[PDB]
Antibody
Framework: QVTLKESGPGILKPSQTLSLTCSFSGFSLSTSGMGVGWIRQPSGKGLEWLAH???????SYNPSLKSQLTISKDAARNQVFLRITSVDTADTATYYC???????????????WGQGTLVTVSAAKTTAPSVYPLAPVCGGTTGSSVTLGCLVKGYFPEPVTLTWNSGSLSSGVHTFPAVLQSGLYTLSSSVTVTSSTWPSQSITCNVAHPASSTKVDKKIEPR | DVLMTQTPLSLPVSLGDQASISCRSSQSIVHSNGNTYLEWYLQKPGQSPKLLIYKVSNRFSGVPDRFSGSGSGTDFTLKISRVEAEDLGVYYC?????????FGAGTKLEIKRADAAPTVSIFPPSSEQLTSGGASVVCFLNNFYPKDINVKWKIDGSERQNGVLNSWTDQDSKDSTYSMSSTLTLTKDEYERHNSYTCEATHKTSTSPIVKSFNRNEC
């Protein structure tokens, strides 16, 4: 079959040069009129076309990024490369290598994509999170459900993992996608239980940040 | 550049319904050769986009015929005759006629269900965070429908526009609701300088905001 496989540095710092590779099979860039390109997608956002290179060495670029982009190929190796100079945090994205031919005979459409390579561009250092318990506001109850929370603040890199009662409470739970403040990530999770359950039965936020070897169990204490 | 405008950006449907997604281009995408390089792509979560339709109405091999592409000039439509669960995801239109090649912003095909009011909860800074020298106030707005919601934070009765970060869950696979976390981050100094902290949520399920508050001094 035709396959496209991207590779990249995983993480780099702002100002550095991103060098991506696409290794492919089941077709040749020496075929008239074959082409291969790159499209990226920041997490949670849309698709941005970057560049394309044709069998005859002609190249096409997104004008907005022309001063940072260089696309190239080694047809003998079945490889296409993209260089991006002076990357910054905005160049954090999944980068996909795609085939697109110039004619209808070979397919002038993006039928074949790789699975993509994630590049993180950050000047952040490995940073352990602080883990904070979120107890309901005083005092009574005063209804049939109670909601607790846990705030995981100021970590790098991703991910953190969070469970409640070691997993043994694993519904009534909403754990939210991490967001960037800085620099550093922050994540929250809420758990909702029957009012008679807590504070009488203990509820604990279990958080792990592998990259800093952090493991924290934070019991939610009533006010 | 050619802007590709998709309408709507979120399309709630029930399984078995007909779905229609519009895509408009800001200039013509008839290339100088005869062709209109208008494509539709579907991206399911955790996967690469997949080609559905090219040159306006040509279904790609292996795409089922419940998918159809139509239109003319600057106005295009993707139609699904009966939505299956496997079809849920983000639909992109795209033009390959003019450089830069451009995608629309994406239309998320999602599930309809009955309106549900958010359960709103407010939490003060923890003792731990305060000893550490900071102060975050957290508001959860959980299990609501539709997805559209406004949170505002007030301090001593006055709107606080700065220092707020929000996070949203995808539609729940079991109950088809949405949830949201909002955190107001202050300096410990700012926190200790004011007393009333309010999270209010405006949602179509109420003409009046849902208001959750606390007074720091009573904590």
């Amino acid at each position: 079959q035709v396959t496209l496989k991207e590779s990249g540095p995983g993480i780099l710092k702002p100002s550095q040069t991103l060098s991506l590779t696409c290794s492919f099979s089941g077709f040749s860039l020496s075929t008239s009129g074959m082409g291969v390109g790159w499209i990226r997608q920041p997490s949670g956002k849309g698709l941005e076309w970057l560049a394309h290179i044709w069998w005859d060495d002609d190249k096409s670029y997104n004008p907005s990024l022309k001063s940072q982009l260089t696309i190239s190929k080694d047809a003998a190796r079945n490889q296409v490369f993209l260089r991006i100079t002076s990357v910054d945090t905005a160049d954090t994205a999944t980068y996909y290598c795609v085939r697109r031919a110039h004619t209808t005979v070979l397919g002038d459409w993006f039928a074949y994509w790789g699975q993509g390579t994630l590049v993180t561009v950050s000047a952040a250092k490995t940073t352990a999170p602080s883990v904070y318990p979120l107890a309901p506001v005083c005092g009574g109850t005063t209804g049939s459900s109670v909601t607790l929370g846990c705030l995981v603040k100021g970590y790098f890199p991703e991910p953190v993992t969070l469970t409640w009662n070691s997993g043994s409470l694993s519904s009534g739970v909403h754990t939210f996608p991490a967001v960037l403040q800085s620099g550093l990530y922050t994540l929250s999770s809420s758990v909702t239980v029957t009012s008679s359950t807590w504070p009488s039965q203990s509820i604990t936020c279990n958080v792990a940040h592998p990259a800093s070897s952090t493991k924290v169990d934070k019991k939610i204490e009533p006010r | 550049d050619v802007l590709m405008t998709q309408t709507p950006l979120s399309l709630p449907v029930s399984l078995g319904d007909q779905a229609s997604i519009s895509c408009r281009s800001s200039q013509s995408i008839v290339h100088s050769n005869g062709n209109t390089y208008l494509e539709w792509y579907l991206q399911k979560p955790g996967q690469s986009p997949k080609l559905l339709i090219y040159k306006v109405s040509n279904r790609f091999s292996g795409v089922p015929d419940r998918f159809s592409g139509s239109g003319s000039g600057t106005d295009f439509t993707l139609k699904i005759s009966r939505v299956e669960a496997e079809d849920l995801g983000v639909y992109y239109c795209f033009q390959g006629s003019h450089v830069p090649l451009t995608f629309g912003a994406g239309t998320k095909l999602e599930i309809k269900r009955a309106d549900a009011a958010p359960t709103v909860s407010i939490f003060p800074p923890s003792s731990e965070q305060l000893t550490s020298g900071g102060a975050s106030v957290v508001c959860f707005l959980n299990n609501f429908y539709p997805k559209d919601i406004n949170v505002k934070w007030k301090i001593d009765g006055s709107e606080r526009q700065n220092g707020v970060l929000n996070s949203w869950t995808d539609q729940d696979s079991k109950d088809s609701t949405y949830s949201m976390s909002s955190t107001l981050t202050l300096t410990k100094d700012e926190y200790e300088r004011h007393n009333s902290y309010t999270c209010e949520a405006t949602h179509k399920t109420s003409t009046s905001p849902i208001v959750k508050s606390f007074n720091r001094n009573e904590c």
